[PDB]
Design a protein around this ligand. Structure first.
Ligand SMILES: Cn1ncc(Nc2ccc(CN)cc2)c(Cl)c1=O
Ligand SMILES: [Ca+2]
Length: 117
């Protein structure tokens, strides 16, 4: 909505962002996304995926107050899942993790936006 696009993230907001990030990191199906993709696990991953992203990179950015608006936090998180569904076929375990964990992220994001008032 309006707040998501326009309102700068505060320290109070960042407590909520850390909580969302921690809940995804704790999720059983987040295991493929905790750390940057290992090129030795994924042939030509870094020649195919132009903007890699992972939850540890996101954790560093949250710690550093990298994000000015919620939209940018959402865009990084969306990269994790969109990258995975582009690189992997739809029957891959990685792809299935992206489906589950994105739906979880959307639930938690909705709770974050509601409590932002
Ligand atoms: C193509 N590809 N390859 C790997 C991967 N995640 C991952 C993370 C940790 C381990 C254990 N080292 C193994 C796999 C993802 Cl998400 C992906 O899209
Ligand atoms: Ca995308």
């Amino acid at each position: 909505d309006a707040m998501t696009v326009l309102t700068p993230l505060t320290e109070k907001d960042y407590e909520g962002l850390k909580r969302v990030l921690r809940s995804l990191q704790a999720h059983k199906m987040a295991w493929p996304f905790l750390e940057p993709v290992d090129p030795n696990d994924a042939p030509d991953y870094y020649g195919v995926i132009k903007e890699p992203m992972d939850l540890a990179t996101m954790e560093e950015r949250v710690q550093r107050r990298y994000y000015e608006k919620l939209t940018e936090f959402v865009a990084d998180m969306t990269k994790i899942f969109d990258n995975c569904r582009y690189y992997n076929p739809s029957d891959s375990p990685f792809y299935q993790c992206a489906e589950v964990l994105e739906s979880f992220f959307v639930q938690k994001l909705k709770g974050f936006k509601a409590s932002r008032s």
